[PDB]
Every structure is written in structure tokens, then in C-alpha cells.
């Protein structure tokens, strides 16, 4: 499918957008073999542990 | 002569510790501040060759 990351920015005022292997600003100009998404909820003080 | 030239032209497909052996991949995946760290290793390896 066409992966548009623009809908992620306006969805919520995120306060943590750490990206390790790719600069976020270029995310719209790349192609990937496969994508995995994982979701869970934790407390604030544990956020640094991810 | 053929062996030397073949080795010299083959040495361009080595990462030398970086994440990839293609410059355009690095220049299209990372911000300019983080590109120099990867570029330097390739530069040094190719200079040595």
C-alpha cells in the first residue's frame, strides 16, 4: 500500500519522535520491504526505557 | 595488470564499517550531521586502496 506518514503528524501532538536509522523528515521519500507496528500503553516514567 | 585493476575496481563494494557501500543510500536516509560519520570511513578505505 501507499504509506503516507503525513497523517501521523496532525493526528496527535506527540512529545517523543525518536528515529534511529532514518531521519524523520525523509520518511516520505523512501521505500521499505516490510513494516511492523506494535502498540501498547505504559506509564510516563517508563517511556525512557523504550 | 588485469589482476591489480580488477582488485582496485572490486574494492568499491566494501562497507569498511559503515552501514552501506552506496553513497546515495546514506545521502537519502540521514540528516547532514549524521552523514559525515558514515562518509569518513568510506573515504579512508578508498584512499588506502
Curated annotation (Swiss-Prot), chain B:
Q: Which residues form a coiled coil?
A: 1-39
Instruction: Write down what this protein is called.
Output: Spike protein S2'
> What is the originating organism of this protein?
Severe acute respiratory syndrome coronavirus 2 (2019-nCoV)
- Give the protein's function: Subunit of the fusion protein that is processed upon entry into the host cell. Mediates fusion of the virion and cellular membranes by functioning as a class I viral fusion protein. Contains a viral fusion peptide that is unmasked after S2 cleavage. This cleavage can occur at the cell membrane by host TMPRSS2 or during endocytosis by host CSTL. In either case, this triggers an extensive and irreversible conformational change that leads to fusion of the viral envelope with the cellular cytoplasmic membrane, releasing viral genomic RNA into the host cell cytoplasm.
Organism lineage: Viruses, Riboviria, Orthornavirae, Pisuviricota, Pisoniviricetes
